[PDB]
Design an enzyme around this catalytic site. Structure first.
Site, PDB file in Angstrom:
ATOM      1  N   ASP A  47       0.824  -1.215   0.000  1.00  0.00           N
ATOM      2  CA  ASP A  47       0.000   0.000   0.000  1.00  0.00           C
ATOM      3  C   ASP A  47       0.862   1.271   0.000  1.00  0.00           C
ATOM      4  OD1 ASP A  47      -2.548  -1.316  -0.049  1.00  0.00           O
ATOM      5  OD2 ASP A  47      -3.195  -0.475   1.849  1.00  0.00           O
ATOM      6  N   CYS A  77      -2.341   0.572 -13.546  1.00  0.00           N
ATOM      7  CA  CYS A  77      -2.400   0.591 -12.094  1.00  0.00           C
ATOM      8  C   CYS A  77      -3.542   1.533 -11.747  1.00  0.00           C
ATOM      9  CB  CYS A  77      -1.037   0.976 -11.501  1.00  0.00           C
ATOM     10  SG  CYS A  77      -0.199   2.446 -12.267  1.00  0.00           S
ATOM     11  N   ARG A 134       3.613   2.438 -10.961  1.00  0.00           N
ATOM     12  CA  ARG A 134       3.886   1.001 -11.140  1.00  0.00           C
ATOM     13  C   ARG A 134       3.902   0.599 -12.621  1.00  0.00           C
ATOM     14  NH1 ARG A 134      -0.426  -0.920  -6.415  1.00  0.00           N
ATOM     15  NH2 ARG A 134       0.288   0.651  -4.873  1.00  0.00           N
ATOM     16  N   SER A 135       2.957   1.114 -13.405  1.00  0.00           N
ATOM     17  CA  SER A 135       2.913   0.789 -14.832  1.00  0.00           C
ATOM     18  C   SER A 135       4.204   1.208 -15.534  1.00  0.00           C
ATOM     19  CB  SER A 135       1.709   1.490 -15.482  1.00  0.00           C
ATOM     20  OG  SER A 135       0.440   0.985 -15.024  1.00  0.00           O
ATOM     21  N   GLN A 142       6.762   7.798 -10.512  1.00  0.00           N
ATOM     22  CA  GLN A 142       6.123   8.866  -9.727  1.00  0.00           C
ATOM     23  C   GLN A 142       6.931   9.345  -8.533  1.00  0.00           C
ATOM     24  OE1 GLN A 142       2.257   6.625  -9.210  1.00  0.00           O
ATOM     25  NE2 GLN A 142       1.384   8.669  -9.457  1.00  0.00           N
TER      26      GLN A 142
END
Ligand SMILES: N#Cc1ccc(CCO)cc1
Length: 282
Positions: free
Chosen positions: A181, A215, A221-222, A262
């Site tokens: 998370d 994502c 994440r992508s 990110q």
């Protein structure tokens, strides 16, 4: 510089935030006018994540052709990817329309439907064989065929039917279920194992349309997934694998979609994954 020793040099000097901010400063800026039209407000999950006009995927529809999705085309590596946001309640039908129209074999999902107690994307695939889904706005039917649950990821076989023509296709759903998370994984081992399972399926290969990867926003994440894949492929293709420059590859990918990677922790994790993955390849 090479990668593994550039890596140790940034760790010892604690400069990951400065490296990452340089990338943000140098990244391309292109218009995203279609994304910002008022009629598309409920087609975007986040107001600050939009596809560029020059690389956006168009739906084959004359009313409204907009979806928050981008085509990332990597010329030297000979790989293409579609990066997209997690579907919204009012875009699940558009999502599967895109999968159909672009001839994709696989969908790669890097988030859970609920994280941090909030919804990160719609429940857009069926959970029981006998309870199929119909998307009436785009005239598609989706059925769960089989499901294989492992410790870090789940693979599902799905049938997508175009109800206008009665054609059917088999789609593979690769669901990485254990990204934490907060933060990034401590080891890249399970992420790499997952990448290799996607590869082995044929979903990334030129005989199919581009893989669809998402994502929540489709950039973090992508971005990690496609950056690692492309860098490892270039290291296999070239005479001198130490010539692969991960920061330059990332800037190339950011010509096609804003914001890829990110955080500075995601950047460090991408380095780690490529470094460890290059040892297993041989
Ligand atoms: N494919 C591919 C690829 C992408 C980026 C780069 C760095 C260009 O200087 C090289 C190759």
């Amino acid at each position: 510089m090479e990668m593994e020793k550039e890596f140790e040099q940034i760790d010892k000097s604690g400069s990951w935030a400065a490296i990452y901010q340089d990338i943000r400063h140098e990244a391309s800026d292109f218009p995203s006018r279609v994304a910002k039209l008022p009629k598309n407000k409920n087609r975007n999950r986040y107001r600050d994540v939009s596809p560029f006009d020059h690389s956006r995927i168009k739906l084959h529809q004359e009313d409204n052709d907009y979806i928050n999705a981008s085509l990332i085309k990597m010329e030297e590596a000979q790989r293409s990817y579609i990066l997209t946001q997690g579907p919204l309640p009012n875009t699940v039908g558009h999502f599967w329309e895109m999968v159909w129209e672009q001839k994709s074999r696989g969908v790669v999902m890097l988030n859970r439907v609920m994280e941090k107690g909030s919804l990160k994307c719609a429940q857009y695939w069926p959970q029981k064989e006998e309870k199929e889904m119909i998307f009436e706005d785009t005239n598609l039917k989706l059925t769960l065929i089989s499901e294989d649950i492992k410790s870090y990821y789940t693979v599902r076989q799905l049938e997508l039917e175009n109800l206008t023509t009665q054609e059917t296709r088999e789609i593979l759903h690769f669901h990485y279920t254990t990204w934490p998370d907060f933060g990034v994984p401590e080891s890249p081992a399970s992420f790499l194992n997952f990448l290799f399972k996607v590869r082995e399926s044929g979903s990334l290969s030129p005989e199919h349309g581009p893989v669809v990867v998402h994502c929540s926003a489709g950039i973090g994440r992508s971005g990690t997934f496609c950056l690692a894949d492309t860098c490892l492929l270039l290291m296999d293709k070239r005479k001198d694998p130490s010539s692969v420059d991960i920061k330059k590859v990332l800037l190339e990918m950011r010509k096609f979609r804003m914001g890829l990677i990110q955080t500075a922790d995601q950047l460090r994790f991408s380095y780690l994954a490529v470094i460890e993955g290059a040892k297993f390849i041989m």
